[PDB]
Amino acid sequence: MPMQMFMQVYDEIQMFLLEELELKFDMDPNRVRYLRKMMDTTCLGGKYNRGLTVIDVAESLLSLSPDGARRKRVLHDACVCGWMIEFLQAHYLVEDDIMDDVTVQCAINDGLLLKSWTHMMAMHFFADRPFLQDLLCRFNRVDYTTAVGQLYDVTSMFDFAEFTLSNYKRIVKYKTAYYTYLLPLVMGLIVSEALPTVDMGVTEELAMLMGEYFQVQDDVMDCFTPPERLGKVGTDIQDAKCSWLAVTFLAKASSAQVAEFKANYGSGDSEKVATVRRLYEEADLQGDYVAYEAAVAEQVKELIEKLRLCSPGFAASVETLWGKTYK
Amino acid sequence: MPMQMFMQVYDEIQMFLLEELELKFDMDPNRVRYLRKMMDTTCLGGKYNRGLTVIDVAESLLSLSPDGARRKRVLHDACVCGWMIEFLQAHYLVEDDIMDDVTVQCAINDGLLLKSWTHMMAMHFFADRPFLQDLLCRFNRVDYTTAVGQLYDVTSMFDFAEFTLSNYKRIVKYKTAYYTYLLPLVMGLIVSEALPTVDMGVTEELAMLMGEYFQVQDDVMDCFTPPERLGKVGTDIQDAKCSWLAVTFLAKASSAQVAEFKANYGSGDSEKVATVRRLYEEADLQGDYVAYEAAVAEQVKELIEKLRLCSPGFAASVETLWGKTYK
Ligand SMILES: O=C(O)Cn1c(C(=O)O)cc2ccc3ccccc3c21
Ligand SMILES: O=C(O)Cn1c(C(=O)O)cc2ccc3ccccc3c21
């Protein structure tokens, strides 16, 4: 039911956005169809885990409520919010695709339209909701945060001085955790009108920890999960990314090993990448990964309990989010 | 005084944005300085005619008022609004520079930050102004409009069917007129609290006409003004742009001339570009330019009078905007 509900609302948002262009922005059918296809290609394909998280938070607050004929209103709002994040994520992916000629002009334009669509859908569907101003401001701030996080990530090499766990955490927090973990949880709370009933501190902390757990797992999979299983080719080593593997390796490697790492990192050359993988393997980083992740897991599991004592319905949605991340 | 005032407020906005990053977004001095330099490079250099228009509208409404100790408040607000448009323009120019690798990653990131900065500066400087919500919504809608205009422009060739004056007007209106002419005039009215005292219809019409007059002049200069005088190399012919010259030529050229135009347009080849220039010259389009612009001038001069009979102070600022465009 959640996925079927989410797809049903997508059709509603899409029809609104496309008719608005036709009726108010003087768009020709050809461009309207081009935008329908582009919207489908960029917004549909994934697992929708950011969007579905909004539904799961709202669904937990209806079944485990702190109501009647207005249930379908909360679920609909959860779906528009879910699509705002999915469209913002779609916007970032297009931006990333430019980062790595009418095709370039169209990709840039798609990036701009996807972001503008998040505002358009909010302004229409939530037009007379009292939460509209707070929702717009939290969304925009998270978007700024992400772009700032993207700066810390893209310029993490200037070179190895910023390869620290505190800077890694700074990158994860700003680049990933705010829009991937904090925002879906917060949007599900906004639509349920249950925002001041939860400890934001514990939630922010949980979002940053789950973001950390997810990014650490993502960094490790990028290096060790083969392309057919991973879906794409792992490029963190070549790109000289400030990854969890790099910063953990640099704190436990010997001076010679660090010298060997510095001379081989950030190169497209097959043998240098293999030397890096060999160094990670030999420094028992896959073992350290298990312990770091299990220590994060202990911290996550402890904070969910603190949350459950004041906000039970919310803690069970933060538990399902965690289960998805943990597996 | 306007320019000195505008630069003084830029220093204030810049300091706010940069301190906000340092104190609230955990930014290191190195990146703060990098962003100061990028902000200066992208926002400072031009003639500031969009930004200054906001000041000139507010200045006309203080000297020709429909007040006392709150004069400096209106002028300050006019300067923050002026910088919002200058930053949005800076955002579009960066986006255009990508349209024609840490440099590409940084340009994309700069594009995102410049747009996010327009929201950040508005949310801070106008935090408890009652006009904040209306200002944010009008700004965002104009930004969407521009991206839609950029779609009509970039895909004007699909090929010659869209080379009509009504489509040219559609491109100009959405791509240029809304953010260049309508928005600065509207923002100067918002800060002066004189928005419902003016006929929006006549103003929209004037903005679209001045936008048309400016784009027609810009299109003609791109073709005939030499690179040392123009500042840059004219590429409209090569790019196969839906320019005023192209659409006017296609309505007055003979079937053979149109055939000759179609076989030569949209090519980088020096001889084909020269053939296009020769066709424009031989079809007396520089003569037609004078008559089209003078007919637009007659329409502009007539609408300013209608505006002056109800909103005199506003008409004199729309007159100065016009004088700048006309010369
Ligand atoms: O579908 C996604 O957005 C990505 N994704 C995937 C995936 O199948 O790629 C698994 C998984 C687990 C938890 C998530 C939590 C927040 C956001 C995304 C998550 C996620
Ligand atoms: O400075 C600019 O923004 C561009 N510019 C120029 C220039 O010197 O390039 C002349 C001129 C005249 C009128 C304008 C009206 C609105 C926006 C820009 C205008 C403009």
Which ligand ends up closest to the CA of B327?
Answer: 2
Q: For residue A105, what is the nearest residue in chain B, using CA coordinates?
A: B99
* Closest Cα in chain B, distance from residue A313 (Å): 31
Q: Whose CA is nearest to atom 20 of ligand 1?
A: A49
- Kindly give, in sequence order, each residue whose CB lies less than 8 Å from that of residue B178, ignoring residues fewer than 6 positions away: B142, B145, B146, B149, B207, B211
Angle subtended at Cα A218 by Cα A217 and Cα A219, rounded to the nearest 5 degrees:
90
Phi then psi for residue B200, to 5 deg, are: -65, -35
C-alpha–C-alpha distance, residues A213 and A133, integer Å? 32
SS3 content of chain A, % helix, strand, coil (to 5): 80, 0, 20
Residue in this structure with the two tokens 């709002």, named with its chain if needed: A77
Across the interface, of B102, B148, B154, the residue whose CB is closest to A105 is: B154
What does the buried/exposed string (b/e) look like for A280-302 if buried means 16 or more CB atoms within 10 Å of the residue's CB? Answer: beebebeebbeebbeebeebbee
C-alpha–C-alpha distance, residues B274 and B280, integer Å? 10
For residues A116 and B143, is the Cβ–Cβ distance under 8 A?
yes
Measured between beta carbons, the chain A residues lying within 8 angstroms of B148 are 21, 25, 27, 113
Q: Is B46 in the pocket of ligand 2 (CB under 6 A)?
A: yes
The tokens describing B298, both together, are: 């007659």
Q: Taking the mean position of all CA atoms in its chain, how far away is CA A253? A: 31
- Kindly give, in sequence order, each residue whose CB lies less than 8 Å from that of residue A215, ignoring residues fewer than 6 positions away: A172, A176, A177, A244
Q: How far is the CA of A325 from the centre of ligand 1 (A)?
A: 7
The tokens describing B78, both together, are: 């006019």
The tokens describing A267, both together, are: 């190169």
Angle subtended at Cα A90 by Cα A51 and Cα B26, rounded to the nearest 5 degrees:
85
Q: Which residue, among B99, B140, B145, would best test binding to A if mutated, counting the most A CBs under 10 Å from its CB?
A: B99
The gap between the terminal CA atoms of chain B, to the nearest Å, is 22
User: In this structure, which amino acid lies at residue A65?
Assistant: S
Domain boundaries, chain B: 1-327
Three-state secondary structure string covering A240-260: CCCCHHHHHHHHHCCHHHHHH
C-alpha–C-alpha distance, residues B84 and B97, integer Å? 20
Taking each helix axis as running N to C, give the angle between helix A132-154 and helix A71-99, from 0 to 180 degrees, rounded to the nearest 10.
20
CATH architecture of residue range(s) B1-327:
Orthogonal Bundle (1.10)
C-alpha–C-alpha distance, residues B279 and B194, integer Å? 49
* Closest Cα in chain B, distance from residue A65 (Å): 32
Measured between beta carbons, the chain A residues lying within 8 angstroms of B34 are 155
**Eight-state DSSP code of residue A160:** G
Q: How far is the CA of B327 from the centre of ligand 1 (A)?
A: 57
Angle subtended at Cα B131 by Cα B127 and Cα B137, rounded to the nearest 5 degrees:
95
Q: How far is the CA of B36 from the centre of ligand 2 (A)?
A: 25
For residues B70 and B23, is the Cβ–Cβ distance under 8 A?
no
User: In this structure, which amino acid lies at residue B275?
Assistant: T
C-alpha–C-alpha distance, residues A192 and A195, integer Å? 8
Q: Is A45 in the pocket of ligand 1 (CB under 6 A)?
A: no
- The candidate with the shortest Cα–Cα distance to B83, out of B52, B131, B51, is B51
Give resolution in angstroms: 2.6
For residues B106 and A154, is the Cβ–Cβ distance under 8 A?
yes
Burial of B13 (0-12, 13-18, 19+ CB in 10 A): buried
Q: How many CB atoms lie within 10 A of CB A318?
A: 27
The tokens describing B316, both together, are: 């004199």
Q: Find the farthest-apart pair of alpha carbons in chain B and give their distance in angstroms, rounded.
A: 69
Q: 3-class DSSP state for residue B210?
A: helix
The tokens describing B79, both together, are: 């300067």
Phi then psi for residue A283, to 5 deg, are: -90, 10
User: In this structure, which amino acid lies at residue A5?
Assistant: M
User: In this structure, which amino acid lies at residue A118?
Assistant: T
C-alpha–C-alpha distance, residues B20 and B269, integer Å? 50
The tokens describing A52, both together, are: 């579905």
